[PDB]
Design an enzyme around this catalytic site. Structure first.
Site, PDB file in Angstrom:
ATOM      1  CG  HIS A 216      -2.112   0.897   1.067  1.00 50.87           C
ATOM      2  ND1 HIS A 216      -3.013   0.778   0.031  1.00 50.87           N
ATOM      3  CD2 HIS A 216      -2.545   1.932   1.824  1.00 50.87           C
ATOM      4  CE1 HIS A 216      -3.951   1.701   0.157  1.00 50.87           C
ATOM      5  NE2 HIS A 216      -3.690   2.414   1.238  1.00 50.87           N
TER       6      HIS A 216
ATOM      7  CD  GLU B 225       1.713   8.439  -1.196  1.00 55.46           C
ATOM      8  OE1 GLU B 225       2.038   8.613  -0.002  1.00 55.46           O
ATOM      9  OE2 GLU B 225       0.525   8.362  -1.572  1.00 55.46           O
TER      10      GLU B 225
ATOM     11  CG  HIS C 190       0.105  12.825   1.206  1.00 55.73           C
ATOM     12  ND1 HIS C 190      -0.679  13.328   2.221  1.00 55.73           N
ATOM     13  CD2 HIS C 190      -0.740  12.208   0.347  1.00 55.73           C
ATOM     14  CE1 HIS C 190      -1.945  13.038   1.980  1.00 55.73           C
ATOM     15  NE2 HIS C 190      -2.010  12.359   0.849  1.00 55.73           N
TER      16      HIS C 190
ATOM     17  CG  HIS D  56     -14.035   4.533   4.613  1.00 56.43           C
ATOM     18  ND1 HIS D  56     -14.019   4.288   3.256  1.00 56.43           N
ATOM     19  CD2 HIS D  56     -12.750   4.763   4.969  1.00 56.43           C
ATOM     20  CE1 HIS D  56     -12.777   4.362   2.813  1.00 56.43           C
ATOM     21  NE2 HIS D  56     -11.987   4.648   3.832  1.00 56.43           N
TER      22      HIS D  56
END
Ligand SMILES: *[C@@H]1O[C@H](CO)[C@@H](O[C@@H]2O[C@H](CO)[C@@H](O)[C@H](O)[C@H]2NC(C)=O)[C@H](O)[C@H]1NC(C)=O
Ligand SMILES: *[C@@H]1O[C@H](CO)[C@@H](O[C@@H]2O[C@H](CO)[C@@H](O)[C@H](O)[C@H]2NC(C)=O)[C@H](O)[C@H]1NC(C)=O
Ligand SMILES: *[C@@H]1O[C@H](CO)[C@@H](O[C@@H]2O[C@H](CO)[C@@H](O)[C@H](O)[C@H]2NC(C)=O)[C@H](O)[C@H]1NC(C)=O
Ligand SMILES: *[C@@H]1O[C@H](CO)[C@@H](O)[C@H](O)[C@H]1NC(C)=O
Ligand SMILES: *[C@@H]1O[C@H](CO)[C@@H](O)[C@H](O)[C@H]1NC(C)=O
Ligand SMILES: *[C@@H]1O[C@H](CO)[C@@H](O)[C@H](O)[C@H]1NC(C)=O
Ligand SMILES: *[C@@H]1O[C@H](CO)[C@@H](O)[C@H](O)[C@H]1NC(C)=O
Ligand SMILES: *[C@@H]1O[C@H](CO)[C@@H](O)[C@H](O)[C@H]1NC(C)=O
Lengths: 201, 596
Positions: B327, B357, B360, B487
């Site tokens: 992941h 990423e 991030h 979720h």
């Protein structure tokens, strides 16, 4: 006259272990001959700063004796060692005056002073009732008091401790790895000057 | 006695130990995830439970400072987080049973097994298998079978537990002086500081729905066009005026429509922008893929990568015998330690993932100087949107040409541009209505406006008019439709997947305004622009110190949250799609059904 009785810079700059910052280590050097050329030209020093005497002129005029103050600090607090600065190092652990003479060397020591399991042999002071007077060390470890609750040296509601431990590790990023700092202070009392450089043929 | 000053020393004491303990926990988790073994599992638990049990005494001491006389805003906000008692407000048995019900919900969701009728022993899971059945395939019987089996074997058996979980956690939320439970979720979107910047939960509920009525023209035409093309593909399966079944969306729940591009491509002959062969030709290995993405951030003005990110990070495939997860994650271990874990391959999708990423990591590095309790995004949706901004700005044909990945004589024009815009249309504006409807349904369930019998007889009864999805087969209440979602059993906030979207384009719009670049909004670029860097860096460095309303002031003048660029970014497509459905009536009548 050819150089003899060199000052023991090798012990200070290449010691086996440095102490903490709240009990910042002191050394008195006098009555010898000093060679600052090796200190200046070395490429292993990250920071070499002062204002009172230019580094080149340091070999020209010389003083009575020198105090070498050695400790190990964090990465971002290297700049904290300067006159008229506020923090947790220039206020509660090591105070420098507003008329300081001598100056500061600081270099990275991640590959000697760090351990994979977390080095807990280094502590620093965090609380104090009154600020630190210039050039003074305090080594008491009395239990701190915050409020009006009378604590008989026992932890509890609002009664604290003055020392907290570092967490040095090899995987830490830059700015938090341990940096070794040596501060030289020069004294100019009316007694004869002792420590300074050589003559050339 | 003074109360204001004596909190500062307590905070100073707390931060020092919190930093080290969090670092130890994060390092244990990283070592477990990178390298898995029977020895590196229990030590992670030993660190994690210690960290969790450490947060119950510092919180306990943070109740004897009477937070009604504290005047400084920063200290009051810092103590606001610590005073949150948590899940220990009730008796021990209720908390233990709630933890057990959460754990059993997770396990039951994670033990999905359904077998084919013809072979009562041939079961497939959510791993590559039944998920692929309704994702990439052309059959109407197997998709119905898989959908019905999943929604009747998992979800119908989870309803009794969720029934008690809802009421128990609602009472827990009321135990913290709140009217409901959904107010707790809205709590992160609350500011009570400077006048003129304040926010309220009711204002949130009124404004998140008001910003939806402006996008109906952009959704009705897309729905009509998709329905017409699917009816052309599937003969005598959809009424010309009705709504479309759930089986054919492309996913289990219809969260994404990205799998429908190959079916409904308008210009089939015209090829897409593919650079896989060009990437392969000149040995685009793992390291230089990230090294190029570094340059995109360096040129704008953002800080350069630290020496050590290239050493610790596990960028490539681990090997053969070192099992690890794949992941894509961006770890921020603290104390100046940042790493990235992702099983890389030489594809453009991995290129975009690497850029996301990197964004991030840059955002995480932005607010490193704040106090420990304030190292988070301004709200839930600021990490992610900042993530997709770079991905949106890096897929432009101009930037790809600049890095020498396309032939300089390329012939981008009308047809291929509309073809490209259609692909991103099906993904972004295809998620807003479903997200809004699910969040609305969850909040209505939590509010208790609906009795025990109006759970599964109103979810579809509103889904049919908010999205336009019909009941493939009738069902009684014993089912539980939303429970079969990621979720919904792990109890994660879900509105973060809606506002984020809008934020992206708003930022883009402002950035495009700070771009002076002439052209349609789809091709607006931000690379090679120092003027576009400071405007964002003055917002990334705030952290949670300032209210997010003031954070949305160094980028966009309007402190509100209005849907301006969703009606701008898809500006040409819409004004082209008006010429597409020139004969097909838009809208959907919610009476025609597969059973009637
Ligand atoms: C709340 O307290 C903090 C910590 O003292 C204040 O932050 C400092 O504020 C002074 C001026 O009040 C500045 O000169 C400092 O630079 C600030 N930072 C630090 C680290 O000292 C903050 O201003 C206070 N907020 C109030 C009083 O509203
Ligand atoms: C965390 O829980 C404790 C105990 O459950 C709360 O303390 C009580 O708060 C109520 C509020 O009306 C008072 O009536 C009690 O007298 C308090 N008891 C004690 C022993 O403090 C505490 O308030 C909770 N934390 C917060 C932030 O509300
Ligand atoms: C603006 O974009 C151009 C185009 O890529 C950049 O110019 C290139 O710079 C590299 C060296 O960094 C050269 O090898 C290329 O030949 C250049 N290409 C062209 C077309 O000039 C330029 O560096 C970018 N500007 C900034 C500030 O990043
Ligand atoms: C200096 O040199 C002289 C002769 O060159 C020698 O006698 C003396 O020992 C030297 N001084 C030392 C070695 O300290
Ligand atoms: C410390 O030891 C190193 C290694 O031999 C040496 O190069 C350096 O000159 C020494 N420094 C001092 C001040 O003695
Ligand atoms: C991964 O864990 C196993 C189990 O202890 C160990 O033998 C191996 O050396 C580890 N690998 C690395 C790279 O540390
Ligand atoms: C990152 O970029 C800056 C700006 O050019 C440069 O000074 C720095 O040395 C770079 N860092 C590394 C590790 O190359
Ligand atoms: C795209 O639209 C323009 C605007 O009318 C038109 O001139 C052009 O021919 C179109 N491109 C095609 C049809 O490939």
């Amino acid at each position: 006259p050819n150089i003899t009785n060199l000052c023991p810079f090798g012990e200070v700059f290449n010691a086996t272990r440095f102490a903490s910052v709240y009990a910042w280590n002191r050394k008195r050097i006098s009555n010898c001959v000093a060679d600052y050329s090796v200190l200046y030209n070395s490429a292993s020093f990250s920071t070499f700063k002062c204002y009172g005497v230019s580094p080149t002129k340091l070999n020209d005029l010389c003083f009575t004796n020198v105090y070498a103050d050695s400790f190990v600090i964090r990465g971002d607090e290297v700049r904290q060692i300067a006159p008229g600065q506020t923090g947790n190092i220039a206020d509660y652990n090591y105070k420098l005056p507003d008329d300081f003479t001598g100056c500061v060397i600081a270099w990275n020591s991640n590959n000697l002073d760090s351990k994979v399991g977390g080095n807990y042999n280094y502590l620093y002071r965090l609380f104090r009732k009154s600020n630190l007077k210039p050039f003074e060390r305090d080594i008491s470890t009395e239990i701190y008091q915050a409020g009006s609750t009378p604590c008989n040296g026992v932890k509890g509601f609002n009664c604290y401790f003055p020392l907290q431990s570092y967490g040095f590790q090899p995987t830490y990023g830059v700015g938090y790895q341990p940096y070794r700092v040596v501060v030289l202070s020069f004294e100019l009392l009316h007694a004869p000057a002792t420590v300074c450089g050589p003559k050339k043929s | 006695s003074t109360i204001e000053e004596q909190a500062k020393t307590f905070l100073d004491k707390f931060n020092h130990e919190a930093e080290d303990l969090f670092y130890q926990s994060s390092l244990a988790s990283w070592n477990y995830n990178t390298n898995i073994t029977e020895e590196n599992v229990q030590n992670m638990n030993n660190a994690g439970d210690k960290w969790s049990a450490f947060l119950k005494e510092q919180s306990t001491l943070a109740q004897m400072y009477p937070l009604q006389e504290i005047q400084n805003l920063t200290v009051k906000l810092q103590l606001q987080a610590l005073q949150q008692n948590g899940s220990s407000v009730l008796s021990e048995d209720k908390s233990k049973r709630l933890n057990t019900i959460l754990n059993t919900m997770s396990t039951i969701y994670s033990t999905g097994k359904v077998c084919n009728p013809d072979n009562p022993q041939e079961c497939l899971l959510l791993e590559p298998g039944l998920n692929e059945i309704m994702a990439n395939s052309l059959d109407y019987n197997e998709r119905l079978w898989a959908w019905e089996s999943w929604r009747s074997e998992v979800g119908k058996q989870l309803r009794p537990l969720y029934e008690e979980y809802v009421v128990l956690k609602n009472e827990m939320a009321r135990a913290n002086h709140y009217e409901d439970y959904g107010d707790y979720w809205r709590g992160d979107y609350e500011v009570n500081g400077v006048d003129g910047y304040d926010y309220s939960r009711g204002q949130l509920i009124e404004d998140v729905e008001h910003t939806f009525e402006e996008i109906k023209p952009l959704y009705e035409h897309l729905h009509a066009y998709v329905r017409a093309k699917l009816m052309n593909a599937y003969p005598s399966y959809i009424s010309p005026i009705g709504c479309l079944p759930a089986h054919l969306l492309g996913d289990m729940w219809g969260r994404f429509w990205t799998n429908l591009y190959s079916l409904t491509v308008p210009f089939g002959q015209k090829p897409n922008i593919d650079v896989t062969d060009a990437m392969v030709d000149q040995a685009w290995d793992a390291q230089r893929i990230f090294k190029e993405a570094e340059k995109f951030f360096v040129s704008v003005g953002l800080p350069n990568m630290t020496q050590g990110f290239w050493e610790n990070s596990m960028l490539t495939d681990p090997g053969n015998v070192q099992k690890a997860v794949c992941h894509p994650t961006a770890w921020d271990l603290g104390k100046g330690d940042f790493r990235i874990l992702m099983c890389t391959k030489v594809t453009m999708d991995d290129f975009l993932t690497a850029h996301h990423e990197m964004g991030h990591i840059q955002y995480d590095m932005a607010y490193a100087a704040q106090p420990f309790l304030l190292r988070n995004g301004a709200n839930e949706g600021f990490h992610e949107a900042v993530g997709e901004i770079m991905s949106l700005s890096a897929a432009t044909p101009k930037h790809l040409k600049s890095i020498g990945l396309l032939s300089p004589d390329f012939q981008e024009d009308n047809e291929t541009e509309i073809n490209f815009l259609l692909k991103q249309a099906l993904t972004i504006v295809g998620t807003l209505p479903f997200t809004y409807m699910l969040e609305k349904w969850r909040w209505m369930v939590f509010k208790g406006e609906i009795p025990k019998d109006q759970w599964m007889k109103k979810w579809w009864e509103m889904k049919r008019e908010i999205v336009g999805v019909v009941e493939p087969v009738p069902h009684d209440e014993t089912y539980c439709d939303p429970a079969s979602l990621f979720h919904v059993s792990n109890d994660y906030s879900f509105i973060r997947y809606y506002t984020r979207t809008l934020y992206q384009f708003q930022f883009q719009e402002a950035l495009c305004q700070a771009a002076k670049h002439e052209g349609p909004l789809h091709k607006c670029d931000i690379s090679n622009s120092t003027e576009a860097g400071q405007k964002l860096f003055n917002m990334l460095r705030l952290g949670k110190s300032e209210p997010w309303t003031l954070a949305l002031e160094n980028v966009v003048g309007a402190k509100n949250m209005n849907v301006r660029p969703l009606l701008n970014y898809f500006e040409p497509l819409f004004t082209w799609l008006k010429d597409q459905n020139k004969n097909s009536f838009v809208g959907w009548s919610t009476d025609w059904s597969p059973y009637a």
